[PDB]
């Protein structure tokens, strides 16, 4: 996250950290939608062009954290992965379309002041909030420059008109994604913040909703491009099948 700021403790309790067991490194971001299910971008678990194909054992998730490095004692909860689920029509060859996937935690996690699930949008909220000019929020432990972040970083980004997205990009942005970012303030999702949640606070009920997923944060601020985010609503359908079929 570039040009962002340090988050306040408990500011984003649905924030999750995808962690590689060995090597011991930070993979991606993720979000708690339930006490048993974690959401994230697909290109975090699978991406042949780089030889990424994690099994449900190559990693584990850390919930409730603030600090990137330290093991926050009595705060963060270590959670294992039962079964990963990548979306079938996930094209990486083409444009990271349908860049999304679910992970079921081995055991239910207990919610605390620093661990609470986020809300998945519905057509109503989705249709009234997703609008050009309308801001959302991005969090993650991604790079600071274009630098490592001591703690979770946070940045609010304005959505951009679909006409100004497809244009500035020589990529094929599908219906299952949208782009956000200021036009040439700077600040955006940098690599590593991927899988993180893109959220908005509904004025109809005061609850935070995850409108999208971080799939291609606009480089790292440099004027010209906008980050590509998964359209969580346009894919909520798949999400439920997976959770429903359990």
């Amino acid at each position: 996250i570039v040009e962002g700021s340090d988050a306040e403790i408990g500011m984003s309790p649905w924030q999750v950290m995808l962690f590689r067991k060995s090597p011991q490194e930070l993979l991606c971001g993720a979000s708690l939608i339930s006490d048993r299910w974690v959401l994230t971008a697909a290109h975090c678990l699978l991406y042949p062009p780089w030889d990424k194909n994690f099994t449900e054992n190559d990693l584990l998730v850390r919930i409730g954290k603030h600090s990137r490095t330290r093991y926050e004692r009595n705060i963060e909860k270590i959670s294992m992965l039962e079964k990963i689920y990548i979306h079938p029509r996930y094209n990486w060859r083409e444009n990271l379309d349908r860049d999304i996937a679910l992970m079921k935690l081995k055991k239910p996690v207990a919610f605390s002041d620093y661990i609470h699930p986020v809300c998945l949008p519905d057509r109503e909220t989705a249709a009234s909030l997703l609008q050009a000019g309308y801001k959302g929020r991005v969090t993650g432990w991604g790079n600071l420059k274009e630098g490592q972040p001591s703690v979770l970083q946070v940045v609010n980004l304005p959505i951009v008109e679909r006409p100004v997205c497809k244009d500035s990009t020589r990529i094929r942005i599908t219906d299952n994604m949208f782009c956000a970012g200021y036009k040439p303030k700077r600040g955006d999702a940098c690599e590593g913040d991927s899988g993180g949640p893109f959220v908005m606070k509904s004025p109809f009920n005061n609850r935070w909703y995850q409108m999208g997923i971080v799939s291609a944060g606009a480089g790292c601020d440099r004027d010209g491009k906008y980050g590509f985010y998964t359209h969580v609503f346009r894919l909520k359908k798949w999400i439920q099948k997976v959770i429903d079929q359990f």
């Binding site: 700021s5 306040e8 403790i9 408990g10 500011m11 309790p13 939608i33 605390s112 002041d113 620093y114 609470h116 699930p117 986020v118 809300c119 909030l129 000019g133 309308y134 801001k135 959302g136 929020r137 946070v154 609010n156 304005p158 908005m200 606070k201 509904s202 004025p203 009920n205 005061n206 609850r207 935070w208 909703y209």
Partner: peptide, 28 residues
């Protein structure tokens, strides 16, 4: 699903340092 409400903020009638900034973008 009591989701979407933050224990240390909503649940205590407290706002975070920059959430108003989002509302404003909504209310134009």
């Amino acid at each position: 699903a009591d989701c979407g409400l933050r224990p240390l903020f909503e649940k205590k009638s407290l706002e975070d340092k920059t959430e108003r900034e989002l509302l404003e973008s909504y209310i134009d």
